[PDB]
């Protein structure tokens, strides 16, 4: 793995609340949360009801050997994101609605490749 060669709990990860590459799915950086290897550090609080969702989502990965194609996770993901409401952060760059379309687009076929290898296996 790429991540071998680096380099602890509270190191590699996110204090500030991004919004970079906002419809760009493998570059997203939204909250301190929300995107692919990119995550808050310990304690941080998340920065939106989305960023929060995104929150849970990481941490039941991580829970879960690492498995980004946990049902559960996924399923809980597409859940909360239908669910996200009320003020985003101060500098919020993204448009809150498109953001969360993009990333349920990942998430729903992340549930469908999950559903696949269990049927099989
Ligand atoms: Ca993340």
């Not at 991540?3 to 996110?14: E, N, P, R």
């Not at 939204?30 to 995104?54: F, N």
């Not at 239908?82 to 687009?105: E, H, L, Y």
């Amino acid at each position: 793995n790429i991540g071998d060669l680096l380099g602890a709990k509270d190191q590699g990860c996110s204090r500030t609340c991004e919004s970079q590459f906002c419809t760009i799915a493998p570059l997203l950086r939204y909250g301190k949360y929300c995107g692919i290897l990119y995550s808050g550090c310990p304690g941080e609080r998340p920065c939106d009801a989305l960023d929060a969702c995104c929150m849970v989502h990481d941490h039941c990965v991580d829970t879960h050997n690492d498995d980004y194609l946990n049902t559960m996770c996924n399923e809980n993901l597409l859940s909360c994101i239908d669910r996200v409401s009320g003020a985003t952060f101060p500098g919020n760059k993204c448009n809150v609605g498109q953001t969360a379309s993009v990333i349920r687009g990942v998430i729903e076929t992340a549930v469908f490749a999950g559903k696949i290898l269990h049927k099989r296996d």
